Design a protein around this ligand. Structure first.
Ligand SMILES: NC(=O)c1ccc[n+]([C@@H]2O[C@H](COP(=O)([O-])OP(=O)(O)OC[C@H]3O[C@@H](n4cnc5c(N)ncnc54)[C@H](O)[C@@H]3O)[C@@H](O)[C@H]2O)c1
Ligand code: NA
Ligand code: NA
Ligand code: NA
Lengths: 500, 500, 503, 498
């Protein structure tokens, strides 16, 4: 862990606007915390509205200059590839900074860095593969083509749980398509985003193509979502903030891409491989202490094996090892902040009040090495039903609910009974049945006999309140493009509708 | 005309909800006017917000039943084709009804009916051509596929200028993809939309798949944009209402598709075919009395031919024949309502007060055959510049402004100097220069040596404040689809992250 | 009830001629050919037997039409409306066309109805595809250039079809050719021209420019080499057997002409112990015996898991004994006759091949003796057992109402055996374990694999073979693509002298 | 020093993971066409070697080590090959110049292209695994999965050896195929070198194989073996036709690129000195030995005389010499046999009445005496009926025909058996576009001559070939479609009695 602290000795503490590392316009700063020990680890600039607007205007100026937007797609791909290579080269430092900033295990952080390399690499390869189309015009003597152009100036806002990963999903396609961008990471987790800006700067982009704003969402966020020079706002986070952003984006009829979490079902039939299902239910509920957009917080298990499954899950939950993300034996780290731990704690009272049982966990751990950190015990909530708040709302902590179902129709009905629609799983050795269910779930991603996979090759996003648009895949790239129909009349003749 | 009045004797006067023609829940009605003579030609139900809610719930019930959403794409295509055939079969009566309701010339209405038949035909043919893709998974022993499903329940709101045409652009892809829909036409122009619902009923769709709500947006529009069971709201009209709709859609993180008009440039270089340019300047400015999303209201003409151009334009403008749309000699009909004529009128005062010249036109005709209708003279405004409201704001009437430009670079700068980005034209015999300009205009559609063309094969929509999303083409169909990534782990193994 | 006689009355109004450059014409030498009904071997019609000079004239008319641009430069949207119009003509004459196909080929009327419904949908699919993809805009790596790929009709196409599903195979070739803007010259099998003549009559009513569509009638040995080897042909599309297909490809090579070939198969039907047993017996029958096994996709090679082989063989044999043979026009008929004297001789010869190599004819293997079948080209549905992969009866395409049954021990063995042929067209896997079926499907070298089904093909998806089963695809977007050619147009928008060479 | 590079270069075939000699111990001498010096000696492979390599490629394919590797990972390896080409660009350029005679600057350009070809296909590898289909049958799921085509044989020619190899190798590897490649027997150096570089990157045993030797000995095995799924060949029409006839024996897919008679259409309103500049480039780069060489100039009648004299005056100034010397503009032709063919065509042209306006012979100068040089040539007063106009000479020779109308230019340009590429020069871009639309060519340039790149497909109409190389279409030659149809609620049909 002190080796990670050493990394901070060379890390920038500033915003990056129009090709320069700059302080806040009023010199304000913010102290960054390590959730493992609640110690202040770094101090960064806290930007102003003026800074955010300046970055947006620099992005517009750069976009209009054409240096990046009119560069060949092949060359843009090379630059995006160079970024992927930097990430891999600095994987260790990046993974350690991510663990320090966010608390999750170092092995999870390394996995994030592998994913990030692959995201940049995927978009590097896609950059030059589709420039638009030739249309067969229904009008004689005309030519019709659709040209795909970069959407323009894009603002990008990320959350605190997977900072660099979420940033990469936005940055890679933006750069690949020729856009100029302004990014703002979560004010409590800026370290790896600062670092990636330092790396991108070495790759070499024209002034203003990339810009980094650091600051509170209530201060600079509205500028980023409501400015008339922005062509697209892309946000990953919670529903309350996402709705706010969308309403603000409306003022200029600005494109929005949103991913807003979920209430992700994990559907376990009685003909599932039982021990696989237990394993994956643990993984679904407790990776990163449940702070994952796709966390499997809502377990739905067939009635015939429900009690056995609950007991098996509880027995394993008792063995989950909490601690420092830098310690190799740690299986689950702390939650992100005092506010977030307070949210999770409040839900325990809620669950009990509405009739559910806390079968295991449901409080902070007592153990000595955990008392100064933001820890919360992995928790199983039983005797639940779909009417309850603890089932319907995104807790975003190390908490899972267990509900029973009798039939395949009942599972589908329950799984779809939420305001969300991000991801979910179906476990059954009967692949035919699993497919039937998968076809009926209103979710952007359905895993059959798995839990958690996402990758650059495939689009990710939500039905219903889980979002608008997609990230990753060809659809992810398309968020950063705009279509133009250029129609040429090759034998123009007067219409003579109006009197001569 | 009186035979079109005879047509009304058989037209429905009601809403269509859940397979039934039905009155308003409050029994309220609205009188429909003919703008040519301001006479009441028809009376229809004025629905309530509970009617809109009921239609939405019926559309959701139908969608979940699967009767349409799970029908084969091939069969959905055949039913869309059957609607197309009905449009052609009833072309004469439909064109007459459109002229009666909107005031446009019969020729214009026939052209509209021919386009509508082709829109339905296009989407009928697209219905079974793309169900998603197979993905090359980066995870060994996994199968990854992206399945494209209908987006779900969609609400569709249309304007009064091209009622049935705009309806076709939304209805055709919605039905082709398997969505259930709730449509609400402009309260002052419901006639052809009622008629097409009659024709769709004849083709036959499951109960709840198609629903027609009649009434003012100030009453039922908030339900249509803000209800939780809606998956996509698609709107065509003005910016004010579009913004309000988007803010309301945000409450449920609902997809939006918007087309909100434009300030469309018509750029004429000194090396244009002169007489072609004059002809098309007239066509761009005055078809449907300038009430076109893509009307060419902002003429930019190269300085060396400016005086020549304005005199030729103005001399042609004086010869424009106003009158009854049913009269074959009419070149321009009336504007749509007293409210809209009043807005156009008020802009003449703005133009004069800010320093522009009304070169010709600028008033209501008062002659016998026009005095009783909502006519407004075709108008040319000169000696204006980009700082003026008359240049920046969409008047949406039979009015054009004329600005000069010195160079190709200045033409592009002026053309892009508006909040809009829908469509525009470049006129020049130097095709190379026309293409350079077309690549730099921030517009969804650019015509080279033409003005007005749109067709089902190519997407249509705006950059900037002209909208979000596209209609027509494969991209328009994609508004009505949602992607689902189904990932199957074909050799699942325990991860064993958490201790045994 | 009077259906056969009413079908025969149709022939009184059917053209007997070729259709070349907008006109119905006799053969240049006035030769003719008698067409028979395989049910009774009677002559039912006489048609012109064209010459190589007629074939050449039609190719030159297709080339002239192509170059005129009336169809090739017509808008895609309008081409699509015309292809739809053909689709609607097919539906308008469904009954007559189906009856004609039964009269000419012998298969049951119910089978012919299904063909006509399929044909309607093939034309409708391609009508709808016609205006959906004109090419692509390319991201040029050269500054100050514009790059696009335009898709154009491939040009003049010759199309040669076989005798088993004459109108269906014709539709697979004609539909995309017309949708894309090609000119075509079609030659149906000499022994089965009736529905193809009728469809030409219907296409003429729809209306196409002179020379866009041409029909040649004649023996492949007389006019075929002209159709595969003429310098003015851009693509030769053929469906039939391997020997003719290879000959055609070698002749097409003389002008480096594109070929699309579908040459039959040795299609495996893989039945696991955990299959739905009665479903597998039902589909083994369907696989083996629809159209008397004269189907490119026939399931002639049954591979059954050893643990249920005896039970399966017994169940299949008992059902085979019940199959009702007879006239295709009779409602109770389940299987009609085979197509010709020659083809029946081939099938019979393979019975002797099988026995000589040690296989058993478990049921069937002969002409039936029942009085109402004696005058027709009937052959009993047949099951051959005690087979193995080394045998010619297992390796070679018999194309008759004959199936072989081999056992396999494991999933690995089933795959190994199924892939141990020179062919690669289609096959099926029957198992309730869908994961297992999917693993097997991924390992089979076949253009189409069905999981718990047998026979489905449709316009929406490409059909064709791996290995000796073919080259290229028919149906789907890939089928359309056979009839298109890509052109890269690259415009230098800032041209400058290279100044490489001295001045 | 290119000669010193040879001290470390392999002299053997690469079969099933090993560098091996042939059972034929008579090696082949490789020549530098600039001085006709023997510069290297290599194994001459046998039929038996070719068969062994095809069997190894089949074994490797069935093993799944490459064919079932993830597309993402295959892309990474193809990228690694791209990086090797860039790392070694200088050495590879010198080897290509040494082996083929072309100028060092042209060789550098090939190497930059080659890097980009591999990089393009590396990026494409994981971008399309097939389609989901909307089945017309209720309760069925339909998907089209794209698999590697299988075992592919690849045969390349002597003019652009490594470039032509890259066009085939890159998509084969990206898609998961196993390959057996055989370069032209007279130009194997850069192909040997790239196999050494691929071995460094590392591929499963048998995935890549290099056969060296005469097509007349091993070619029939490569085109006619039953275990081959696709034969991809670039060269001349008569070998191509032979290959296609042999591939028919197993109904094997073919992709052919067979050259052309490429027109260069110059209108009166073209930029005149641009058109002269580009006519020289079209005709004489690599001494005309280019699949897409602009050997057939069609010039509008108002400027024809002026154009001909301008072109002839420039042709007289073209600098012949050693490709390694910076002043050289045009190197030698490839071989004795090829120079002989060019010479024979001059006799054909004269006997049929055409005029040899300039050139048409070997040069007289002393430093050119030892090499395979041939003078850049312009033939005038000819017409479309002549063999010299219709047939691919593939040497530093152009013909000039006049025309009046754009319709005539189109008709003459299309009046050949070929259809590979061509150009239209005119400042009237609308006119150039109308012409481009009617030309039966795989690539048409407006106001340029020669460009090709990985992003766009390349190939011929008519006798110029079958299929495409480069672009997404090029990748598609190396894939095969499989429709997997699952019936999700299977019911008995009950057609047959029970
Ligand atoms: N398209 C091009 O870029 C290109 C390149 C070289 C030659 N050509 C044309 O072809 C003419 C003849 O040239 P060439 O004879 O030197 O080349 P060719 O057409 O025979 O092509 C050479 C390649 O084909 C191989 N080959 C020869 N016989 C073979 C066989 N039976 N089976 C398989 N492969 C075989 C050679 O070993 C070599 O790899 C030239 O004059 C020129 O017109 C075109
Ligand atoms: Na932190
Ligand atoms: Na017959
Ligand atoms: Na050499």
């Amino acid at each position: 862990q002190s080796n990670a602290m050493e990394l901070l000795k060379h890390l920038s503490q500033r915003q990056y606007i129009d090709g320069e590392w700059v302080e806040s316009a009023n010199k304000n700063t913010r102290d960054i915390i390590n959730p493992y020990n609640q110690e202040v680890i770094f101090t960064v600039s806290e930007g102003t509205k003026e800074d955010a607007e300046r970055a947006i205007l620099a992005a517009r100026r750069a976009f209009e200059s054409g240096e990046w937007s009119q560069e060949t797609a092949e060359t843009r791909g090379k630059k995006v590839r160079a970024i992927a290579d930097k990430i891999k080269e600095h994987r260790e430092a990046l993974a350690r900074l991510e663990t320090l900033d966010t608390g999750k295990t170092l092995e999870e952080s390394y996995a994030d860095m592998d994913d990030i390399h692959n995201v940049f690499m995927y978009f590097a390869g896609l950059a030059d593969k589709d420039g638009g189309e030739m249309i067969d015009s229904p009008i004689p003597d005309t030519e019709s083509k659709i040209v795909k152009e970069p959407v323009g100036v894009v603002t990008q806002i990320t959350p605190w749980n997977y900072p660099l990963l979420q940033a990469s999903w936005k940055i890679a396609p933006a750069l690949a398509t020729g856009c100029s961008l302004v990014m703002k990471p979560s004010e409590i987790t800026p370290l790896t985003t600062i670092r990636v800006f330092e790396l991108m700067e070495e790759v070499g982009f024209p002034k203003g193509t990339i810009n980094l704003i650091l600051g509170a969402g209530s201060e600079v966020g509205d500028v980023m979502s409501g400015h008339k020079e922005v062509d697209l706002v892309s946000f990953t986070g919670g529903i309350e903030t996402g709705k706010h952003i969308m309403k603000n984006a409306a003022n200029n009829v600005t494109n929005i891409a949103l991913e807003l979490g979920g209430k992700n079902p994990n559907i376990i039939f009685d003909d599932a491989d039982f021990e696989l299902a237990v394993d994956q239910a643990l993984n679904g509920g407790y990776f990163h202490a449940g702070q994952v957009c796709s966390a499997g917080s809502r377990i739905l298990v067939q009635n015939s094996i429900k009690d056995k499954f609950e007991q098996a899950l509880i027995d394993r939950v008792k063995k989950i090892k909490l601690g420092n993300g830098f310690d190799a034996d740690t299986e689950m780290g702390p939650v992100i902040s005092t506010e977030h731990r307070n949210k999770i704690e409040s839900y325990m009272d809620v669950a009990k009040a509405e009739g559910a049982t806390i079968a295991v966990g449901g409080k902070r751990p007592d153990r000595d090495d955990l008392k100064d950190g933001l820890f919360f015990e992995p928790t199983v909530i039983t005797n639940c039903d779909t009417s309850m708040r603890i089932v319907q709302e995104e807790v975003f902590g190390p908490v899972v609910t267990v509900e029973g179902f009798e039939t395949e129709q009942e599972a589908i009905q329950l799984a779809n009974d939420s305001i969300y629609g991000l991801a979910g799983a179906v476990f059954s050795k009967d692949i035919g049945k699993a497919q039937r269910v998968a076809n009926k779930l209103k979710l952007g991603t359905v895993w059959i006999n798995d839990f958690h996979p996402y990758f650059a090759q495939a689009p990710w996003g939500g039905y219903k309140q889980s979002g608008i648009g997609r990230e990753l895949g060809k659809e992810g790239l398309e968020e950063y493009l705009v279509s133009k129909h250029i129609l040429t009349n090759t034998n123009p003749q007067l219409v003579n509708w109006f009197s001569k």
